[PDB]
């Protein structure tokens, strides 16, 4: 699984950047994105996807184990709509 460790190492052998800043950029990368989502801003990354924010209302739910119907509290989640470019590169993938 791709981790921040592998991402930093990549920037070291592709951009020749020290692992230090290579590890600091990967952190600030996801950080800045999370700061935009929490602030209520859409994140549109061309050639990748789009992190949307939809306010879901309180809908009926339950306890998957027993079956006790419990109303799922409303909350703002963070969806991800992959671009057409990304889909065309993952359409022919393979779980490995």
């Amino acid at each position: 699984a791709l981790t921040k460790a592998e991402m930093s190492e990549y920037l070291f052998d592709k951009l020749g950047l020290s692992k230090r800043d290579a590890k600091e950029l990967v952190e600030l990368f996801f950080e800045e994105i999370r700061r935009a989502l929490e602030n209520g801003e859409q994140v549109k990354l061309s050639g990748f996807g789009n992190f949307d924010l939809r306010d879901k209302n309180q809908r009926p739910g339950r306890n998957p184990k027993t079956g006790e119907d419990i109303p799922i509290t409303a909350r703002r989640v963070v969806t991800f709509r992959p671009g057409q470019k990304l889909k065309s590169r993952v359409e022919n993938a393979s779980p490995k």
């Binding site: 791709l2 990549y10 800045e32 859409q42 994140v43 549109k44 963070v78 991800f80 393979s94």
Partner: protein, 94 residues
């Protein structure tokens, strides 16, 4: 916040790091995440989220503009699952 506005804000903060460096750095990271999902491997960033791959069974598609049945293959689709820290900070309604 676009792919460009994302680099500008990060470059403004990090002054001890060339602006040009931050530009290519962001582009390489995205390309890396796009290539990983292309190979079949999944991504998992603690605190941010994770990018998995869900399978789609082949079905006789349709044309929502004309109404012609179009053949569709299996194909996979990128999926993102918000992390613990991501959901809490984003959710402004307890």
């Amino acid at each position: 916040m676009t792919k460009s506005e994302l680099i500008e804000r990060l470059a403004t903060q990090q002054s001890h790091i060339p602006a040009k460096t931050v530009e290519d750095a962001v582009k390489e990271m995205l390309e890396h995440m796009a290539s990983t999902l292309a190979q079949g491997e999944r991504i998992e960033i603690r605190g941010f989220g994770s990018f998995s791959l869900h399978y789609r069974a082949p079905r006789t598609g349709r044309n929502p503009k004309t109404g012609d049945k179009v053949e569709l293959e299996g194909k996979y689709v990128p999926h993102f699952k918000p992390g613990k820290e991501l959901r809490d900070r984003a959710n402004i309604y307890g």
